[PDB]
């Protein structure tokens, strides 16, 4: 309605019916919802279809092919444009492959993006709020938040809408507003009004902006603007982006592309220089200009054929399929470079609490101090049943020594639990499980205090939703809290000074301490037994410590915390200086040193995933801020640490890690799988130490403690049910909150790299085969077997659709058993270059051999000796060598169509066996890739179309064929697959079976080779 930063707290609350510590009436909530509108920010699309198709065309390889198409169109100008069949087919053939690749890429990328947006709505935006229906804070959808409504926020939470600080419930509130303000450093905030009529966002410390994160604080505010009216919504029209897509893989592939373009240009120059020197034959070649333009067209067609023009398209489709597959498995990938480098990940750091554990925390055990007869102390050691956040589900098993809960010490413990926490429960209509608000520990204590510990009141039959609010409200109303002590890692405890509402019966002064058992057992010097207090005893404290250690002995890995009482505080806030020394000085002596036991179940799908990670060669390290013993126990349970293992030099804490010999420090950073009780700075130091060893690091976490370190790691991962600070600092978000997605991401990255390698291998082999064919034909003096339109058609049929569909390859069988690759090694090894050269040499030799076969030994063709073939140009119709053979036959379109068909079929066969690097088709039948088979069938259908209709063969300078020539084509094209299988076998064994497939291939093979009458060839020179 109006700006509120200048206005004070009183009138902004009085602007609406809103009141502090209470909520808003439902009727006025819906009235303001109807008037102002929902808190939804329009998600406009930033990538239109036109730019989406243009972004594929921008690359050196595609631009060269566009230039070649333009050159072909220019050179085609020998007759008016009305004729669009005789001379207007080669530019169309050049254009068709680019169009097909662009369509495939845009379709795949659009599918991936459409999948991603639906995933972002898997968990609707949630925000804590105060309403009049439920007395305590309740979570509601952030899409429905009216202005002027009380909204509580805590550490590690996104701000649903612009809120003015009505009150602060913590000592200091530090809020990170980097996304809006651009200030990386967190900004301290206060409730003082803004004295600037138009304050800059930097100097506005009175209000919190929507979309911002709180680094460290607890606060409650009033929403002033919602939806687009928020400071993040009005400026949302302005577009912000990084515009960075140069992944290391794409950078090295671009380097490979430019080197390959240089080599292809050199090869084309060689073609020009070697060939035109002897060209003076009178096939419209007695003039230099005509021969020059013809051989220039030949060179342009060879350059078109010999460059991989689907490379950007295949990269784009591989990334799009990876992202879409992660979208299906409920993982939001906000950074394309992440998944591919997840293939190269070598160390996975992780956050024990919240990510590896299931994050739903419940009370399980409780011991009070029974009657003590001296050094030894008898301990009650109760047990509590129920792991879900439900008061109704807890019955205390009715078997413990007390079921009426009449123990005075139990009453005191319940009061401590109720009055020493800042958490609550709420009932959501979505499920039957009551949601957790606040820290897990405090919420578990709150659901602990529900049972009739203090009073045997008959609350049966009351409101279902009132349980979570009235469970501890009775204790709260009879004893008024005064103030609290900040939780500091120096003492690892929290303290609350409370004065009972009781009319001065109990001295009106109490202190309640919630902390670690060690800290309180050291600080406590006065024990509580029954209703009385006894002097400190070494035996009692030692037995309590032994019970705590037993609770930490593999049952639930020591999640217990202690709750203690200080009966005689020195004074009511005599001094409250914000230093750790005073807080410890205020806890000199205490009482009721008994503890309570908690359970944090490790996630089921973690251990197996960990077992996968060590199979892939990826080390897993647990870096957490918890105790060393708890961390080691959780590691052993998960499987990072072997049971009964020497963990002397593999587990560390932050303090001992900091003070080490640099040689010892670097050795420990390599060989340690567990760091415990580490501050965020220490986690970042560990991550950067790991990265300094040329090692790719991936880290996961769901807390602010892990937020800085996630930035240092190469890959950052945040769980869906975690703090939004981790999400903003991470690259991949696990909405489903399932640890199995990480190994799937590593698998997809490795699969993308493998498919890229297969595409490179297939294209390089086929195209060097075509180049070797041209060189062999030129060198041996044989008639030229490839004219520009035929070369362009080969480029269209063997490079466009099958190679693009090669990007849909299913993952390899041994993909998850290989060590992670080093991103610094050369893209193509020496062995791969040899494989490409061998396959290309065979392809070229096979095509030249097919042509020479038609000229020399053919069933429906003339028989011409090899000597005559090598000297075909030397024809004067009267040569004694050339007697009885018409030398116009050397212009026959039959050898040309032989070469065309042989090249096409051999390249399809090469595409068939390019499914895997070193795996035979017997192990990997092509039926797993239906896209590749369909593409091959469609391309062969196109070949049969251009070969067996009336007009099409005329424009391609080819003729229809019969069964015998096709059989010869298949016979000369098959051995490429056998040669590739031999190379794969050699690579498998010396360098490093589907019976149905054999039963299909064998009869077809014997059918092809049933009749053989193609031997007795002449000498090769
Ligand atoms: F144990 Be982690 F730092 F939440
Ligand atoms: Ca090509
Ligand atoms: Ca090719
Ligand atoms: Mg955590």
Short mmCIF file of C-alpha atoms in Angstrom, two decimals, residues 579-884:
data_model
loop_
_atom_site.label_atom_id
_atom_site.label_comp_id
_atom_site.label_asym_id
_atom_site.label_seq_id
_atom_site.Cartn_x
_atom_site.Cartn_y
_atom_site.Cartn_z
CA UNK A 579 31.29 -12.81 24.66
CA UNK A 580 31.77 -16.54 25.19
CA UNK A 581 33.64 -16.04 28.47
CA UNK A 582 30.63 -14.55 30.27
CA UNK A 583 28.33 -17.34 29.08
CA UNK A 584 30.63 -20.00 30.55
CA UNK A 585 31.09 -17.89 33.68
CA UNK A 586 27.29 -17.91 34.12
CA UNK A 587 27.21 -21.74 34.34
CA UNK A 588 29.47 -22.36 37.33
CA UNK A 589 27.25 -24.94 39.06
CA UNK A 590 24.08 -26.72 37.97
CA UNK A 591 21.90 -29.70 38.91
CA UNK A 592 19.85 -32.48 37.29
CA UNK A 593 22.66 -33.70 35.06
CA UNK A 594 20.50 -36.44 33.53
CA UNK A 595 20.27 -36.66 29.76
CA UNK A 596 17.85 -37.70 27.01
CA UNK A 597 18.47 -39.97 24.03
CA UNK A 598 17.78 -39.24 20.37
CA UNK A 599 17.74 -41.25 17.14
CA UNK A 600 18.84 -40.05 13.69
CA UNK A 601 18.33 -42.92 11.21
CA UNK A 602 20.82 -43.00 8.34
CA UNK A 603 19.10 -42.97 4.97
CA UNK A 604 18.51 -46.43 3.53
CA UNK A 605 19.72 -45.60 0.02
CA UNK A 606 23.06 -44.13 1.16
CA UNK A 607 25.21 -47.15 2.02
CA UNK A 608 24.55 -48.93 -1.28
CA UNK A 609 25.26 -45.68 -3.13
CA UNK A 610 28.50 -45.39 -1.17
CA UNK A 611 29.26 -48.96 -2.23
CA UNK A 612 28.75 -47.82 -5.82
CA UNK A 613 31.06 -44.83 -5.40
CA UNK A 614 34.05 -46.93 -4.34
CA UNK A 615 33.33 -49.17 -7.33
CA UNK A 616 33.56 -46.17 -9.67
CA UNK A 617 36.81 -45.06 -8.02
CA UNK A 618 35.29 -42.03 -6.27
CA UNK A 619 36.41 -41.61 -2.67
CA UNK A 620 33.72 -40.51 -0.20
CA UNK A 621 34.65 -38.23 2.70
CA UNK A 622 32.35 -37.26 5.58
CA UNK A 623 33.01 -33.68 6.72
CA UNK A 624 30.67 -32.61 9.51
CA UNK A 625 30.41 -30.29 12.50
CA UNK A 626 29.42 -33.04 14.93
CA UNK A 627 31.51 -35.03 17.41
CA UNK A 628 34.31 -37.33 16.29
CA UNK A 629 32.77 -40.40 17.92
CA UNK A 630 29.34 -39.85 16.36
CA UNK A 631 30.93 -39.21 12.96
CA UNK A 632 33.05 -42.38 13.14
CA UNK A 633 30.06 -44.46 14.26
CA UNK A 634 27.93 -43.13 11.40
CA UNK A 635 30.79 -43.77 8.98
CA UNK A 636 31.06 -47.38 10.16
CA UNK A 637 27.29 -47.85 9.88
CA UNK A 638 27.23 -46.40 6.35
CA UNK A 639 30.35 -48.32 5.30
CA UNK A 640 32.90 -45.56 4.68
CA UNK A 641 34.97 -47.06 7.51
CA UNK A 642 35.37 -50.81 7.74
CA UNK A 643 34.21 -52.40 10.98
CA UNK A 644 37.09 -53.02 13.39
CA UNK A 645 39.58 -50.94 11.40
CA UNK A 646 42.60 -48.80 12.31
CA UNK A 647 41.01 -45.35 12.08
CA UNK A 648 43.99 -43.74 13.79
CA UNK A 649 45.10 -41.74 10.73
CA UNK A 650 41.84 -41.61 8.74
CA UNK A 651 39.58 -39.63 11.11
CA UNK A 652 40.36 -36.08 12.20
CA UNK A 653 38.85 -33.03 13.84
CA UNK A 654 39.27 -29.41 12.83
CA UNK A 655 41.60 -28.48 15.69
CA UNK A 656 43.99 -31.39 15.19
CA UNK A 657 43.82 -30.98 11.40
CA UNK A 658 44.84 -27.32 11.66
CA UNK A 659 47.94 -28.10 13.76
CA UNK A 660 49.91 -30.57 11.64
CA UNK A 661 53.21 -30.95 9.79
CA UNK A 662 52.53 -29.73 6.22
CA UNK A 663 53.73 -33.08 4.88
CA UNK A 664 51.55 -34.82 7.46
CA UNK A 665 48.72 -32.40 6.65
CA UNK A 666 48.82 -33.13 2.91
CA UNK A 667 49.08 -36.88 3.54
CA UNK A 668 46.12 -36.77 5.93
CA UNK A 669 43.99 -34.75 3.50
CA UNK A 670 44.54 -37.55 0.97
CA UNK A 671 44.05 -40.53 3.29
CA UNK A 672 41.31 -39.29 5.67
CA UNK A 673 37.66 -40.15 5.06
CA UNK A 674 36.19 -38.33 8.07
CA UNK A 675 36.59 -34.80 9.41
CA UNK A 676 34.38 -33.98 12.39
CA UNK A 677 33.57 -30.81 14.35
CA UNK A 678 34.72 -28.42 11.62
CA UNK A 679 33.60 -24.84 11.08
CA UNK A 680 32.56 -23.73 7.56
CA UNK A 681 35.97 -22.14 7.04
CA UNK A 682 37.64 -25.43 7.95
CA UNK A 683 35.43 -27.28 5.46
CA UNK A 684 36.40 -24.80 2.74
CA UNK A 685 40.06 -25.26 3.66
CA UNK A 686 39.69 -29.05 3.39
CA UNK A 687 37.97 -28.72 0.01
CA UNK A 688 40.63 -26.38 -1.38
CA UNK A 689 43.39 -28.66 -0.06
CA UNK A 690 41.74 -31.54 -1.91
CA UNK A 691 41.44 -29.42 -5.06
CA UNK A 692 45.11 -28.39 -4.87
CA UNK A 693 46.08 -31.99 -5.72
CA UNK A 694 44.60 -31.74 -9.25
CA UNK A 695 41.52 -33.58 -7.99
CA UNK A 696 37.92 -32.84 -8.96
CA UNK A 697 35.78 -32.38 -5.85
CA UNK A 698 32.03 -32.80 -5.41
CA UNK A 699 30.39 -31.84 -2.12
CA UNK A 700 26.85 -32.18 -0.77
CA UNK A 701 25.12 -30.56 2.18
CA UNK A 702 21.88 -28.99 3.36
CA UNK A 703 23.07 -26.37 5.84
CA UNK A 704 24.70 -22.97 6.08
CA UNK A 705 27.68 -24.69 7.72
CA UNK A 706 28.39 -26.35 4.38
CA UNK A 707 27.35 -23.35 2.26
CA UNK A 708 30.81 -21.75 1.76
CA UNK A 709 32.53 -25.08 1.10
CA UNK A 710 29.99 -25.95 -1.60
CA UNK A 711 31.31 -22.90 -3.45
CA UNK A 712 34.91 -24.12 -3.24
CA UNK A 713 34.08 -27.61 -4.53
CA UNK A 714 33.91 -28.20 -8.27
CA UNK A 715 30.39 -29.62 -7.85
CA UNK A 716 27.87 -28.42 -5.28
CA UNK A 717 24.86 -30.50 -4.25
CA UNK A 718 21.97 -29.64 -1.91
CA UNK A 719 19.07 -31.79 -0.74
CA UNK A 720 15.48 -30.71 -1.26
CA UNK A 721 14.45 -30.75 2.40
CA UNK A 722 17.48 -28.69 3.44
CA UNK A 723 18.28 -25.03 3.94
CA UNK A 724 17.85 -22.76 0.94
CA UNK A 725 21.32 -21.28 1.54
CA UNK A 726 22.81 -24.62 0.50
CA UNK A 727 20.52 -24.71 -2.55
CA UNK A 728 21.62 -21.25 -3.70
CA UNK A 729 25.26 -22.25 -3.18
CA UNK A 730 24.91 -25.63 -4.93
CA UNK A 731 24.71 -26.78 -8.54
CA UNK A 732 22.32 -29.76 -8.24
CA UNK A 733 19.27 -30.05 -5.98
CA UNK A 734 17.82 -33.40 -4.84
CA UNK A 735 14.11 -32.65 -4.62
CA UNK A 736 13.24 -36.28 -3.84
CA UNK A 737 15.96 -36.20 -1.15
CA UNK A 738 17.42 -39.47 -2.41
CA UNK A 739 21.17 -40.12 -2.31
CA UNK A 740 20.94 -42.65 -5.16
CA UNK A 741 20.72 -39.77 -7.64
CA UNK A 742 24.40 -38.86 -7.19
CA UNK A 743 25.71 -42.13 -8.63
CA UNK A 744 23.16 -41.76 -11.43
CA UNK A 745 24.55 -38.28 -12.17
CA UNK A 746 28.08 -39.67 -12.29
CA UNK A 747 26.83 -42.42 -14.61
CA UNK A 748 25.15 -39.90 -16.91
CA UNK A 749 28.27 -37.75 -17.08
CA UNK A 750 30.41 -40.76 -17.97
CA UNK A 751 27.80 -41.84 -20.54
CA UNK A 752 27.78 -38.39 -22.13
CA UNK A 753 31.56 -38.48 -22.46
CA UNK A 754 31.44 -42.01 -23.89
CA UNK A 755 28.78 -41.08 -26.46
CA UNK A 756 30.85 -38.05 -27.44
CA UNK A 757 33.85 -40.31 -27.99
CA UNK A 758 31.77 -42.75 -30.06
CA UNK A 759 30.45 -39.93 -32.25
CA UNK A 760 33.98 -38.62 -32.76
CA UNK A 761 35.27 -42.09 -33.65
CA UNK A 762 32.50 -42.81 -36.16
CA UNK A 763 32.71 -39.44 -37.93
CA UNK A 764 36.51 -39.35 -38.09
CA UNK A 765 36.75 -42.94 -39.36
CA UNK A 766 34.09 -42.56 -42.07
CA UNK A 767 35.35 -39.19 -43.30
CA UNK A 768 39.02 -40.16 -43.41
CA UNK A 769 37.76 -43.16 -45.35
CA UNK A 770 36.21 -40.87 -47.96
CA UNK A 771 39.39 -38.77 -48.11
CA UNK A 772 41.55 -41.89 -48.52
CA UNK A 773 39.20 -42.99 -51.30
CA UNK A 774 39.79 -39.71 -53.14
CA UNK A 775 43.57 -39.95 -52.69
CA UNK A 776 43.67 -43.58 -53.85
CA UNK A 777 41.59 -42.84 -56.95
CA UNK A 778 43.82 -39.88 -57.81
CA UNK A 779 47.06 -41.77 -57.14
CA UNK A 780 46.31 -44.97 -59.06
CA UNK A 781 45.11 -43.06 -62.12
CA UNK A 782 41.67 -44.66 -62.04
CA UNK A 783 38.67 -42.69 -63.32
CA UNK A 784 37.23 -40.43 -60.64
CA UNK A 785 34.49 -42.31 -58.78
CA UNK A 786 32.96 -39.46 -56.75
CA UNK A 787 31.40 -36.31 -58.22
CA UNK A 788 30.40 -33.39 -55.94
CA UNK A 789 26.70 -34.25 -55.69
CA UNK A 790 27.52 -37.86 -54.79
CA UNK A 791 29.95 -36.73 -52.09
CA UNK A 792 27.35 -34.35 -50.68
CA UNK A 793 24.71 -37.10 -50.69
CA UNK A 794 27.11 -39.41 -48.84
CA UNK A 795 27.73 -36.63 -46.33
CA UNK A 796 23.98 -36.20 -45.85
CA UNK A 797 23.19 -39.89 -45.49
CA UNK A 798 26.12 -41.04 -43.32
CA UNK A 799 26.66 -37.97 -41.12
CA UNK A 800 23.28 -36.38 -40.47
CA UNK A 801 20.68 -38.68 -38.96
CA UNK A 802 22.59 -41.85 -37.91
CA UNK A 803 25.41 -39.92 -36.24
CA UNK A 804 22.94 -37.66 -34.43
CA UNK A 805 20.89 -40.66 -33.26
CA UNK A 806 24.17 -42.15 -32.02
CA UNK A 807 23.82 -39.66 -29.15
CA UNK A 808 20.92 -41.71 -27.72
CA UNK A 809 23.27 -44.60 -26.93
CA UNK A 810 22.37 -46.66 -23.84
CA UNK A 811 25.00 -46.60 -21.08
CA UNK A 812 27.93 -48.98 -21.28
CA UNK A 813 28.08 -52.11 -19.15
CA UNK A 814 31.48 -51.33 -17.59
CA UNK A 815 30.75 -47.61 -17.23
CA UNK A 816 30.68 -47.68 -13.42
CA UNK A 817 33.80 -49.81 -12.87
CA UNK A 818 36.41 -47.49 -14.44
CA UNK A 819 38.54 -44.93 -12.56
CA UNK A 820 37.57 -41.29 -13.12
CA UNK A 821 39.39 -39.70 -16.03
CA UNK A 822 41.83 -36.80 -15.74
CA UNK A 823 40.46 -33.80 -17.69
CA UNK A 824 44.01 -32.81 -18.73
CA UNK A 825 44.82 -35.86 -20.88
CA UNK A 826 44.54 -35.49 -24.67
CA UNK A 827 41.05 -35.93 -26.09
CA UNK A 828 42.13 -38.62 -28.59
CA UNK A 829 44.84 -41.11 -27.67
CA UNK A 830 47.43 -42.65 -29.97
CA UNK A 831 45.55 -45.95 -30.18
CA UNK A 832 42.32 -44.21 -31.19
CA UNK A 833 44.10 -42.36 -34.01
CA UNK A 834 45.46 -45.69 -35.25
CA UNK A 835 41.95 -47.16 -35.16
CA UNK A 836 40.57 -44.22 -37.15
CA UNK A 837 43.35 -44.49 -39.73
CA UNK A 838 42.85 -48.25 -40.11
CA UNK A 839 39.07 -47.98 -40.54
CA UNK A 840 39.39 -45.09 -42.99
CA UNK A 841 42.04 -46.90 -45.00
CA UNK A 842 39.76 -49.92 -45.28
CA UNK A 843 36.76 -47.79 -46.29
CA UNK A 844 38.69 -46.00 -49.03
CA UNK A 845 40.32 -49.20 -50.28
CA UNK A 846 36.92 -50.92 -50.36
CA UNK A 847 35.34 -48.15 -52.44
CA UNK A 848 38.26 -48.05 -54.88
CA UNK A 849 38.15 -51.84 -55.07
CA UNK A 850 34.44 -51.83 -55.86
CA UNK A 851 35.00 -49.39 -58.72
CA UNK A 852 37.97 -51.37 -60.06
CA UNK A 853 35.89 -54.54 -59.71
CA UNK A 854 33.16 -53.13 -61.95
CA UNK A 855 35.74 -52.04 -64.52
CA UNK A 856 37.76 -55.28 -64.45
CA UNK A 857 35.66 -58.28 -63.35
CA UNK A 858 31.91 -57.67 -63.66
CA UNK A 859 29.05 -59.91 -64.74
CA UNK A 860 27.19 -57.19 -66.65
CA UNK A 861 30.14 -54.99 -67.54
CA UNK A 862 33.15 -54.94 -69.85
CA UNK A 863 36.40 -56.61 -68.80
CA UNK A 864 39.21 -54.03 -68.82
CA UNK A 865 42.76 -54.78 -67.70
CA UNK A 866 44.33 -52.90 -64.79
CA UNK A 867 46.96 -51.40 -67.11
CA UNK A 868 44.21 -49.97 -69.32
CA UNK A 869 42.40 -48.62 -66.24
CA UNK A 870 45.52 -46.86 -64.94
CA UNK A 871 46.04 -45.23 -68.37
CA UNK A 872 42.41 -44.66 -69.34
CA UNK A 873 43.01 -41.05 -70.39
CA UNK A 874 45.47 -42.28 -73.04
CA UNK A 875 42.68 -43.16 -75.47
CA UNK A 876 42.95 -42.38 -79.18
CA UNK A 877 40.59 -45.22 -80.26
CA UNK A 878 43.50 -46.76 -82.21
CA UNK A 879 45.89 -47.66 -79.38
CA UNK A 880 47.18 -51.26 -79.66
CA UNK A 881 46.69 -51.63 -75.90
CA UNK A 882 43.10 -50.35 -76.16
CA UNK A 883 41.71 -52.71 -78.80
CA UNK A 884 38.04 -53.67 -78.74
#
